Structure formats: structure tokens, C-alpha cells
Amino acid sequence: NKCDVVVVGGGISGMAAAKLLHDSGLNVVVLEARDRVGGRTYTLRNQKVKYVDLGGSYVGPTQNRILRLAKELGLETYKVNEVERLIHHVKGKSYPFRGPFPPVWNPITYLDHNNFWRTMDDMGREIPSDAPWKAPLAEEWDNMTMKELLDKLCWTESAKQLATLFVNLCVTAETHEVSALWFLWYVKQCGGTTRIISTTNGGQERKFVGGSGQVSERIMDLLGDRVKLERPVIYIDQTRENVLVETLNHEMYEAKYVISAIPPTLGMKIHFNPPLPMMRNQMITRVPLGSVIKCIVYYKEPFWRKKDYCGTMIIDGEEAPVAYTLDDTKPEGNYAAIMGFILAHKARKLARLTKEERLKKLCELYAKVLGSLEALEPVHYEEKNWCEEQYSGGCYTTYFPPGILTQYGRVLRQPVDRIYFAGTETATHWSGYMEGAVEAGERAAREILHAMGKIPEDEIWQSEPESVDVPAQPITTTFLERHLPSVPGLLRLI
Amino acid sequence: NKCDVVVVGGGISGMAAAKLLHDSGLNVVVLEARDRVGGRTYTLRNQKVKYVDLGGSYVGPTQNRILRLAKELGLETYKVNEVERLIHHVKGKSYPFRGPFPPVWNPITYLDHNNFWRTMDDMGREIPSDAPWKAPLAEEWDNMTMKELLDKLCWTESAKQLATLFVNLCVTAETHEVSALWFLWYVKQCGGTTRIISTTNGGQERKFVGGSGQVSERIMDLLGDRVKLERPVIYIDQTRENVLVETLNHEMYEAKYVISAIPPTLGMKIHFNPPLPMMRNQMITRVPLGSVIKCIVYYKEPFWRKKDYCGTMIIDGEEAPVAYTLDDTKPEGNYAAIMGFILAHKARKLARLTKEERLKKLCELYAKVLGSLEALEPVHYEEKNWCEEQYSGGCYTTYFPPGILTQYGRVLRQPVDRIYFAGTETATHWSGYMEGAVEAGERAAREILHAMGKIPEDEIWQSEPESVDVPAQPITTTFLERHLPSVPGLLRLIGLTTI
Numbered sequence: 001n002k003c004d005v006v007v008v009g010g011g012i013s014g015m016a017a018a019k020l021l022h023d024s025g026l027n028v029v030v031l032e033a034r035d036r037v038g039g040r041t042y043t044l045r046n047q048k049v050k051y052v053d054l055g056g057s058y059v060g061p062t063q064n065r066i067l068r069l070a071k072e073l074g075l076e077t078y079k080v081n082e083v084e085r086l087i088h089h090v091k092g093k094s095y096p097f098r099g100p101f102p103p104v105w106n107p108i109t110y111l112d113h114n115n116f117w118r119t120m121d122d123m124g125r126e127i128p129s130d131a132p133w134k135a136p137l138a139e140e141w142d143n144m145t146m147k148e149l150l151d152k153l154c155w156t157e158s159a160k161q162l163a164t165l166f167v168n169l170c171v172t173a174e175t176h177e178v179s180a181l182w183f184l185w186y187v188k189q190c191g192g193t194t195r196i197i198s199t200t201n202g203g204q205e206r207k208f209v210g211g212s213g214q215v216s217e218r219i220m221d222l223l224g225d226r227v228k229l230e231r232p233v234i235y236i237d238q239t240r241e242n243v244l245v246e247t248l249n250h251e252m253y254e255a256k257y258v259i260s261a262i263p264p265t266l267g268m269k270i271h272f273n274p275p276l277p278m279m280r281n282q283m284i285t286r287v288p289l290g291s292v293i294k295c296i297v298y299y300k301e302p303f304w305r306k307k308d309y310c311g312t313m314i315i316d317g318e319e320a321p322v323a324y325t326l327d328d329t330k331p332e333g334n335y336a337a338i339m340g341f342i343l344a345h346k347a348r349k350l351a352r353l354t355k356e357e358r359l360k361k362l363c364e365l366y367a368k369v370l371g372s373l374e375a376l377e378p379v380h381y382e383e384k385n386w387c388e389e390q391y392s393g394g395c396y397t398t399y400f401p402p403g404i405l406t407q408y409g410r411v412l413r414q415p416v417d418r419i420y421f422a423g424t425e426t427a428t429h430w431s432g433y434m435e436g437a438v439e440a441g442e443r444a445a446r447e448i449l450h451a452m453g454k455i456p457e458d459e460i461w462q463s464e465p466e467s468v469d470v471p472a473q474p475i476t477t478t479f480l481e482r483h484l485p486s487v488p489g490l491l492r493l494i
Numbered sequence: 495n496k497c498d499v500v501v502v503g504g505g506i507s508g509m510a511a512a513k514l515l516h517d518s519g520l521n522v523v524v525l526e527a528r529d530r531v532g533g534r535t536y537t538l539r540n541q542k543v544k545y546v547d548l549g550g551s552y553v554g555p556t557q558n559r560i561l562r563l564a565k566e567l568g569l570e571t572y573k574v575n576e577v578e579r580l581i582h583h584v585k586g587k588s589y590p591f592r593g594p595f596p597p598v599w600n601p602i603t604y605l606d607h608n609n610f611w612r613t614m615d616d617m618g619r620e621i622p623s624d625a626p627w628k629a630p631l632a633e634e635w636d637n638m639t640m641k642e643l644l645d646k647l648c649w650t651e652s653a654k655q656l657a658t659l660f661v662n663l664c665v666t667a668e669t670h671e672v673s674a675l676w677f678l679w680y681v682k683q684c685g686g687t688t689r690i691i692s693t694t695n696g697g698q699e700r701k702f703v704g705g706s707g708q709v710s711e712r713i714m715d716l717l718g719d720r721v722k723l724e725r726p727v728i729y730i731d732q733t734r735e736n737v738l739v740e741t742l743n744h745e746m747y748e749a750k751y752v753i754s755a756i757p758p759t760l761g762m763k764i765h766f767n768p769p770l771p772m773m774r775n776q777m778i779t780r781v782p783l784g785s786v787i788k789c790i791v792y793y794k795e796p797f798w799r800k801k802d803y804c805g806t807m808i809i810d811g812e813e814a815p816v817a818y819t820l821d822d823t824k825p826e827g828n829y830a831a832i833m834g835f836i837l838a839h840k841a842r843k844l845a846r847l848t849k850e851e852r853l854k855k856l857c858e859l860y861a862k863v864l865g866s867l868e869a870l871e872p873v874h875y876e877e878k879n880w881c882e883e884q885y886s887g888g889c890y891t892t893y894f895p896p897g898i899l900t901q902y903g904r905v906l907r908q909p910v911d912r913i914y915f916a917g918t919e920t921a922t923h924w925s926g927y928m929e930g931a932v933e934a935g936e937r938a939a940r941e942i943l944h945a946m947g948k949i950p951e952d953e954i955w956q957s958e959p960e961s962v963d964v965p966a967q968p969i970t971t972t973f974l975e976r977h978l979p980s981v982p983g984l985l986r987l988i989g990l991t992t993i
């Protein structure tokens with residue numbers, strides 16, 4: 001019944017918070033709705049795949065908190081394969097390339113593409129990571145969708161198509177679904193365009209040996225019976241001396257404080273006494289999660305490597321079910337596999353099909369893009385549609401429709417009496433990622449330590465030393481990238 | 495514990511559903527989260543006001559279902575005061591007028607205004623009431639906000655400003671917050687622009703004598719102990735032969751079928767076994783309700799009438815806390831009052847203030863708009879901020895942001911095994927209103943009767959005879975209104991002549 005702090009949710013954020021509080025000598029209890037920990041991370045094990053991440057997987061340079069936590073728990077990383085060429089498939093043809101951005105040959109299209117990426121970072125520089133609503137043009141940018149912004153910025157259909165794929169892949173949502181201010185914040189708070197899109201030296205550089213699920217699992221191992229599985233929280237009462245937290249399976253927990261470590265909208269599944277303040281009451285109805293099916297097709301060998309392809313495919317257009325792939329082969333070179341995402345509206349559309357039907361569509365696509373009949377002979381298939389999850393709401397993360405971030409953004413991590421807010425959505429660096437989950441969980445934990453008078457105010461937010469195993473190299477630009485005119489810039493010069 | 499149908503929610507929709515099923519011989523239970531019925535309707539009674547609707551209030555011609563239900567329950571209507579002149583307040587000055595639309599004198603501005611309203615209805619005629627996602631340009635229109643559409647359509651700032659107020663007032667949301675397809679559907683399914691904005695001959699023509707809360711209250715009286723107050727539903731389990739519905743106060747109910755008569759997003763407050771299908775699981779996270787504070791200021795006398803003002807004020811300007819008012823005086827002529835709405839971002843902004851601070855700002859606004867120092871002498875004040883309600887989520891109703899209606903709209907009233915969906919949001923005529931609540935509750939009830947083999951399929955959806963008490967004048971246009979060019983239409987005519 002009784003403890004110091006109840007943590008609602010046993011994903012990476014809830015586990016990170018619970019570990020910090022436990023290590024500080026407090027009695028913690030984690031209440032998890034599912035029969036497993038990990039949340040939006042999930043590692044499946046079987047003989048065919050050995051292990052596979054069906055949820056969150058990638059980590060990379062500048063994500064120092066998740067790297068430090070995993071290392072402490074005994075985990076190692078390996079590099080996602082990017083030795084050979086990437087492929088950009090456009091208008092039914094594959095164009096192999098090297099470097100993070102797909103190249104453009106037409107001079108007008110070149111200027112347009114260059115300007116788009118540059119402008120994304122230009123705008124981001126005016127958006128505070130810890131308060132995007134304080135951007136000088138916050139209201140103007142929040143009142144526009146990404147579709148509207150792209151319509152203004154992109155003078156070529158080539159740039160608009162790639163920009164659209166970029167948005168879809170980053171946030172699993174349509175350009176017309178999301179606020180421009182929120183999306184620009186999202187990219188900036190991951191370190192900008194290059195950092196977020198890059199495998200080598202970016203967010204997709206590495207995976208955990210044995211799977212990312214091990215982070216939450218190994219913290220559960222430490223905490224023992226402090227983690228309560230199949231305990232969905234239904235009710236939180238703050239009217240009395242101690243906070244009371246009730247679960248669906250009829251149990252009552254009593255604590256001094258609570259950490260909410262669930263997606264913001266899933267706060268709706270809890271009945272509150274007293275009611276939430278007006279702003280949070282409405283906020284949690286305004287913040288949906290994106291839509292994605294993660295699909296992994298297995299092959300006898302990583303045959304693409306023989307053609308000097310690394311397995312990365314960037315596939316434009318409405319017809320293709322999957323817009324982006326990476327090589328998912330094990331470090332040993334076995335369990336050869338291609339990972340692909342079915343994104344946003346396509347997740348909704350293709351969910352109607354059978355698993356076997358999706359497999360056929362993916363294999364035929366891969367055969368076309370890789371130019372190999374070997375793609376038509378899969379040995380195994382795994383997939384997960386995150387849209388179906390009651391206790392996630394979607395993946396990868398929460399997006400903000402136009403008008404919401406400026407009106408409600410301030411209340412995301414505002415404490416409600418003795419409830420403090422974790423979850424990757426509340427992070428200021430790599431929000432949306434496993435890194436953000438760690439940042440937010442540890443910060444919420446320290447807010448409580450401060451409330452108990454155990455630490456000073458200046459220790460609530462804490463810097464992280466850089467990983468020695470995954471060091472970051474600087475992001476650079478060329479003179480031409482910095483100074484070439486936009487399309488309208490070249491027109492005004494003429 | 496055991497019954498035929500559990501109805502979740504005791505608002506007008508749930509109560510209408512329960513009544514129909516009860517009248518048909520079935521054993522029903524209504525599980526209501528609050529210590530009262532009525533939901534988004536709420537009639538406050540005290541000695542200072544006698545009675546006052548703090549939620550849903552207005553009914554009008556073409557809303558035949560709510561009129562029939564209320565009549566059967568022994569209720570009467572009266573007409574909202576529109577004897578004297580309406581006021582349009584713009585750029586800090588008041589312009590009195592008659593007719594539903596504020597008049598425009600500038601010929602260019604006139605063309606632009608005429609074309610705006612006309613085009614709203616033109617686009618509306620392309621949108622099926624029962625399937626808005628089937629409009630030929632559904633995707634194009636759904637992928638645009640109302641802000642984007644107004645930016646394209648309005649060639650004058652005057653039209654754009656009034657159109658913005660129109661959107662804010664209809665759906666308690668900003669133009670940039672809402673899908674154009676969804677808003678165009680919402681207006682069309684109320685009968686169009688003229689019907690939705692009109693007092694005389696429109697949505698705001700009448701109120702119930704004694705308050706709208708009586709509708710839900712009198713149905714509760716008929717049902718007796720079948721209505722369970724302070725039973726918020728937390729869990730629905732459909733894995734076994736009978737459906738199990740659990741409440742927060744620990745009770746278990748067992749039924750053949752369930753009707754969910756709550757706002758769609760409030761379905762999130764219920765844990766489902768088995769989990770909802772993917773499309774509904776995500777839909778209920780994508781559909782917020784609007785933001786509004788309804789405010790009623792009381793005076794010694796309806797002093798505005800002496801100046802030939804009826805009490806209606808259409809007020810444009812960021813500084814104005816309230817964008818729209820109506821006379822709220824009792825039909826007897828006493829308890830003189832002005833009702834005003836604080837809309838969308840202003841509801842969020844001004845919620846920070848005290849009740850006394852809000853009263854002061856409203857009085858100062860009304861004094862300026864009415865050119866009357868008497869407005870600074872209120873005798874009483876009542877208000878309700880609907881944004882604070884755990885079991886409503888907002889008011890008046892659910893809005894759809896860009897992209898949602900085409901992707902998720904199909905599943906709004908699709909049954910989930912033995913769960914059927916009521917609530918005003920699922921109506922096809924006056925969705926968002928008390929009328930829509932009645933339509934959806936009775937339709938959901940009949941879906942269950944059909945499932946039980948009690949009625950044929952063709953009786954699920956039923957037409958409603960027109961009220962004999964509230965006649966509906968047709969919506970008409972003039973020749974000039976039909977055929978006058980838009981601003982770009984005129985520019986094309988100029989370009990062609992100069993060739």
C-alpha cells in the first residue's frame with residue numbers, strides 16, 4: 001500500500017525516474033498497465049530472428065543520457081550498416097549516393113533543395129528548446145501547418161516531395177496534420193536537420209546488442225517486486241494528506257508524490273480528484289500520437305551489399321508502401337534483414353491487409369528498388385502496428401496540431417499539486433526518443449527530490465558528460481550551402 | 495447489476511436513448527458520472543436569477559426532434575428578443591441594423607461578403623451529411639484549415655474579419671485549429687449559413703421556459719431508480735457472453751448491449767477489453783472539444799430596448815472579451831440580462847482573471863457597444879467555464895483538426911461488437927446541438943432494437959414530422975445574391991473588356 005513515490009508507467013522514462021529515486025534511498029513503486037515493461041520499446045526474441053526491436057531501436061551521438069544508462073546496465077551498441085551506397089528511388093528509378101542528403105542535379109532544383117534544409121535550421125535557431133512558445137514568431141508559425149510552410153518554401157515539386165517524406169518519417173504524421181512551429185522545434189531540439197537524418201554521426205548510428213527492451217527489463221530486474229505489471233492506473237486522489245493511486249485490478253497505493261510517465265493524452269485514462277486544472281484538462285485531448293507499422297523482412301544473406309548498396313532506401317511517392325529502410329542485419333552478418341516503416345496515412349490504409357499481403361507488397365517494392373530478385377525470397381517476417389496499442393496510442397511520439405503548442409505547451413511539465421510529469425514528450429533534447437525519455441524521467445525524479453528538500457533548485461536540471469564510446473563529430477556546412485540563393489532569390493537577382 | 499442495455503452518460507442523448515428503449519419494454523440502466531443529469535446542458539436555479547441555462551439553451555425551426563421530445567415532457571418554448579435593432583461593432587464603433595447579416599455599403603466589400611456566404615453554402619452542397627469524407631474534393635478540403643480557406647476566399651479584410659468571428663462563434667475554436675472540410679460539413683448539416691446564424695427563423699430563435707436542463711431531469715423522473723448518479727464508467731469487458739460495465743465507485747453492471755452516449759474523446763476515460771480496433775483507438779485521441787465561457791450579466795431593466803437595441807451584439811476586435819451577445823431577459827420581461835460568449839483563445843486567456851474581474855470587463859465592453867452608462871450597473875452575474883469540466887472536455891462540441899475527418903470519420907458511429915455510439919457528435923442533422931443529441935440517442939437505441947430482431951433495418955433511421963409550434967421558413971436568396979460576381983470574377987470581367 002504505502003511508499004514514497006508512485007511512478008505511473010514502466011517505459012524507459014518511468015524506469016529511469018524510479019531507478020534514480022531508488023538509488024537515492026526512497027521507496028518506489030512502478031505501476032505498469034501491460035504484462036510487460038518497455039512501452040514504446042519492445043524486443044521480441046525467437047529462433048528465427050534471435051532478437052528484434054519492434055519499437056524504438058536507434059541511438060546515436062549527442063544522446064548521452066540513454067548511452068550512459070544502458071552502459072551502466074551492462075549493454076553494448078553496434079553500428080547500423082552504412083558502409084556501401086544509400087539509394088534514393090524517384091520516379092521509378094534508383095539513384096545510389098553517398099553522404100546524408102540525397103543529391104540533386106538540376107540547377108534550379110538544387111537551389112530549392114539547398115534552401116529548404118537551410119531554412120529549416122535558420123528558423124530553428126530562433127526557437128528556444130525549453131520554451132518553443134517563446135519563439136519571436138511563435139504564433140505566426142504555430143497557426144500554420146507544415147503543408148502550408150512547404151507550399152510557400154518549395155518552388156519545385158522535387159523539393160516538396162522530399163520535404164514531405166522528411167516530415168512523414170520524422171514524426172509519423174502528414175504535413176497538413178502538424179504545426180510548423182512544433183515541427184521546427186522538434187528538429188531543432190534533436191540538433192537540426194543533419195543530426196536528425198543521419199545514420200553515421202546522427203540519430204540512427206547505432207542499435208543495442210540484444211535489443212533496446214533490455215533497458216526497461218534490466219531496471220525491472222534491479223527493482224524486483226517494486227514493479228507491478230498489469231496494474232493500469234484508473235484514479236488519482238489528491239484531496240488528503242497522502243496521494244492515493246488506484247488500479248483497474250482494484251489495488252490501492254499511497255504515496256507522498258506521483259510521477260506520470262505516460263504519453264500526455266493517456267492521462268485521459270485516469271479519473272482525477274480534484275479535477276485537473278482547465279488548461280491540462282483540455283491539453284490532454286489535443287495531443288495525438290503518430291501512426292506507423294514497423295516491418296522487418298528477413299533474408300538468407302544481406303544480398304544488397306554485393307551490389308554496393310548498404311540497405312538504406314529513401315523511396316518517394318504515394319504508391320510505395322514503405323518510404324524508408326535501413327539494414328537490420330546483426331553485427332555478426334547473420335539474420336540478414338531490411339527494416340522498413342509504413343508511415344502515417346499508409347499505416348491506416350494498409351492495416352486492412354493480412355500480414356502475408358503486406359509481406360508480398362514489401363518484397364516486391366524492395367525487389368524493384370534494390371534491383372534484385374533475391375528480395376522476392378524472404379525467410380521470415382516480423383511486424384508491429386503501433387496504432388492498435390491502447391497503452392501507447394501510436395508511435396513514435398506525440399505531435400501538435402496547428403494552434404496547440406502556443407496555447408497549451410506551457411502546461412506539459414507543470415506539476416499538478418504532488419503529480420510531476422515525465423515521459424519523452426516533456427524532454428528538451430531528443431524529445432520523442434529514448435534519450436528524451438531518460439532526460440524527462442531523471443528531471444521529474446529530481447523535481448521530487450527538490451520538493452523533499454534533499455537537493456537544491458539548481459540540481460533539478462543536470463548536464464550529461466559526452467559518451468566515450470559514441471563521440472559526436474561536429475555538423476558542418478560548405479560556403480556554397482550557406483550562401484547560394486533560393487529560387488526567388490535568384491529571380492530577384494534577375 | 496443485470497439489465498438489457500447499459501447507457502453510458504445521462505446527457506440529452508443518453509436520456510433520449512434510455513427513454514426509447516424503456517418505452518419499448520426493455521430494462522435499461524443509465525450510468526452517469528456526475529451528481530446530476532443534463533451534461534452540456536445545465537440549468538442553475540437561485541433566487542436572483544430564478545433559472546438560467548449555463549450550457550446549451552437555444553432551439554429553433556428544423557430542430558423537430560428536440561422540440562417533440564420536450565413537448566411530450568410537458569415543456570414550452572418562448573422567443574428570444576429580436577424586436578429591436580441588432581448591433582455590429584467593428585473598429586471600435588457600433589452600427590445598428592436589421593436582418594440576419596450585418597449590411598455592407600462598399601460595392602467591392604459587398605461583392606466579397608456576398609461571395610463568402612454563398613461559397614460556404616456552394617461547397618456545403620458537395621458534402622453528404624451522413625458521409626462528409628465522400629465529398630469529391632474531401633481530401634483537398636480536409637488538408638486545409640479554415641484559416642487557409644478564408645485567406646484564399648476573402649479579398650477584403652472586412653469579409654475575412656466577419657468570417658473569422660463566424661467560425662469562432664459556431665465552433666468555439668480558431669480558424670487555424672479546424673479542418674475546412676469538417677467546418678463546411680458542420681454548417682451544411684445545420685441547414686447552411688443563414689439557418690445557423692439566425693435568431694428569427696434560425697438556431698437561436700427560442701429557449702425553453704424554465705431551462706433546457708428539464709429535458710434530462712424529466713426523463714430521469716420517468717425512469718426512476720434506473721438512473722445511477724456518480725457512477726463514472728471505467729471499464730467495459732466484451733470477452734464473455736454478456737457485456738460487463740464497471741464504475742469508479744466499484745459497481746458492476748451486466749448487459750446485452752451498451753450505448754456510449756459521451757463525447758467521443760471521453761471514451762479515453764474507459765479501459766477496454768478487448769482493446770478497441772486500431773481506427774477507433776486513435777480516433778478518440780484526435781477529436782478535442784472547443785473552448786467557451788458563457789457569461790450572464792443581470793440588470794434592473796432591459797435598458798437597451800429603450801434605445802431600440804434588441805440586445806444582440808456582434809463584436810469584432812481582439813480587445814473585446816465577448817464576441818457575441820443575446821438578450822437573456824425572461825419572457826415576462828423581468829430578470830433583465832445579457833448573455834455573452836467568451837470564445838476560443840479568449841476563454842483560455844481570460845480564465846486567469848477572477849469572476850469579479852471578468853464582470854468588470856464585460857460591463858465596460860457593453861457600455862461602449864451600447865453607448866450606455868447603465869451597462870456599468872449590474873445587479874447580478876453568473877458564468878460557467880466549460881473548459882474546466884472533466885466529464886465534458888469543453889463546449890459546445892467536438893471539432894476536427896486538418897486531416898482527421900477523412901482518415902477517421904468513418905468509425906465515429908461504427909459499432910464495436912455490442913457497443914453502439916450515441917451523442918450529438920454522431921448526428922447527421924444539427925450535430926453539436928441538443929437536436930443532434932436526440933437524433934443520435936434514438937438512432938443508437940433503434941440499432942440495438944434491430945440487432946435484437948425487434949424492428950426491421952429500414953426503421954433504424956427515422957424521419958421526424960415538422961413541429962406545428964415552430965414553423966420553418968425556407969432559406970431563400972435573391973437574383974443578385976445568386977449571380978453577382980466575386981471580386982476575382984469581377985477582375986476577370988475587367989480583364990476581358992480591356993482586350
Ligand SMILES: *Cc1cc2c(cc1C)nc1c(=O)[nH]c(=O)nc-1n2C[C@H](O)[C@H](O)[C@H](O)COP(=O)(O)OP(=O)(O)OC[C@H]1O[C@@H](n2cnc3c(N)ncnc32)[C@H](O)[C@@H]1O
Nearest residue numbers: 009011012013033039040056057058233395424432433434
Ligand atoms: C513505436 C516506435 C517508437 C520509436 C521508434 C519506432 C517505433 C515504431 N524508433 C525509435 C528509435 O529508433 N530511437 C528512439 O530513441 N526512439 C524511437 N521511438 C520512440 C521511443 O520508443 C520512445 O520515445 C520512448 O520509448 C518513450 O518512452 P516513455 O517512457 O516516455 O514512454 P512509453 O514507452 O510509452 O511508456 C509509458 C508506459 O506507461 C504505460 N501506461 C500507459 N497508461 C498507463 C496507465 N494508465 N497506468 C499504468 N501504466 C500505463 C505503458 O504501458 C508504457 O509501458
Ligand SMILES: *Cc1cc2c(cc1C)nc1c(=O)[nH]c(=O)nc-1n2C[C@H](O)[C@H](O)[C@H](O)COP(=O)(O)OP(=O)(O)OC[C@H]1O[C@@H](n2cnc3c(N)ncnc32)[C@H](O)[C@@H]1O
Nearest residue numbers: 503505506507527533534550551552727889917918926928
Ligand atoms: C456547453 C455549451 C453547449 C451548448 C451551448 C452553449 C454551451 C456553453 N449552446 C447550445 C445551444 O444554444 N443550443 C443547443 O442545441 N446546443 C448548445 N450547446 C451544445 C449542447 O449542450 C450539446 O450538444 C448537448 O447537450 C450534448 O448532449 P450529449 O448527450 O450528446 O452529450 P453530454 O451533454 O456531454 O452528455 C454526456 C454525459 O455523459 C457523462 N459522462 C462523461 N463521461 C462519463 C463516464 N466515463 N461514465 C459515465 N458518464 C460519463 C457526462 O457527465 C454527461 O452527463
